[PDB]
Amino acid sequence: WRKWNVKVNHNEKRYATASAIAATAVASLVLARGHRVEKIPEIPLVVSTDL
Amino acid sequence: GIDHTSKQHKRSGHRTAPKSDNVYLKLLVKLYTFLARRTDAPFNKVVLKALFLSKINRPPVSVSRIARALKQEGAANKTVVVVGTVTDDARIFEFPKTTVAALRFTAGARAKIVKAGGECITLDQLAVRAPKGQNTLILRGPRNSREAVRHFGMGPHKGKAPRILSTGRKFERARGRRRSKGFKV
């Protein structure tokens, strides 16, 4: 009966998902986590719907 | 073997840096350190102290106290500054036009101030519009009207709300609280 699972406030969980989505913008952060994207087109990369 | 008049290596007791790791707040501190160091006007060294303050010492400041400070004479064109949040208040209905600057505005306060024709201003825009703080106010919310501050200083004859969980009858209103049961206080 150790406290295994941990609550988060729902809005703070939403806050972190919003900040992470905002972080997959401009590629300073993207090159900061591995991610060999040194030559890609403009970031975010949006492929068309056929995929 | 120096005689010690006061205590050695005594930290001054204030904060010099906010304990929070809000990066954007570190940017506002990084701006106001510059402005406090070089503009050498008083208004800047007060807001720098206020960003250092904790959550408790930044109480939320309702929009009605802003309405009081604007009904206060002569301040009817000033830009009120609140370091800390500004929360809504449904008790006022009439509300003036002037501009408010703060860190955080709750959605009710944003809708209210923009609804009356005002403008919510993040403090960098006030640093742009007022480097020396021309024609401004500072409000501070009530600090010691917390829940917890009701409980400090508890002792006999001082009247400060004993620390208790469930109230009503039967929970600490017997001997020690009334004259009929033993003693009072």
């Binding site: 986590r33 990369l45 068309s48 719907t49 | 070089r38 959605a107």
Partner: protein, 103 residues
């Protein structure tokens, strides 16, 4: 993706790649090891549906009782705000960076 038509079975074998619906967007996939940043290959329908999902000033929420977080600062650049027009008018003239040792 926005609308799954057999894409997850296509990419689920090639290692490292994880797919996601816009309705999910797990935090465990968007910042692994709590480090911000992923190489996110959006799709177009997913991009317009992202506009629908997380709200803006234009569309309202799609999550009951939600709006985006707000800025406590308008511009993330600081020295641009420091330099630009108004502040340098009020700034006293600077000293030396490191001080001369006197005595």
């Amino acid at each position: 993706y926005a609308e799954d038509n057999g894409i997850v079975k296509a990419l689920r074998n090639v290692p490292g790649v994880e797919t996601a619906n816009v309705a999910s967007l797990n935090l465990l996939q968007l910042a692994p090891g709590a480090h911000l940043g992923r190489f996110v290959i959006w799709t177009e329908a997913a991009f317009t549906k992202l506009d629908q999902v997380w709200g803006s000033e234009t569309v309202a929420s799609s999550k009951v009782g939600y709006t985006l977080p707000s800025h406590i600062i308008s511009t993330s650049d600081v020295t641009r705000i420091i330099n630009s027009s108004e502040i340098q008018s009020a700034i006293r003239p600077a000293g030396q960076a490191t001080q001369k040792r006197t005595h």
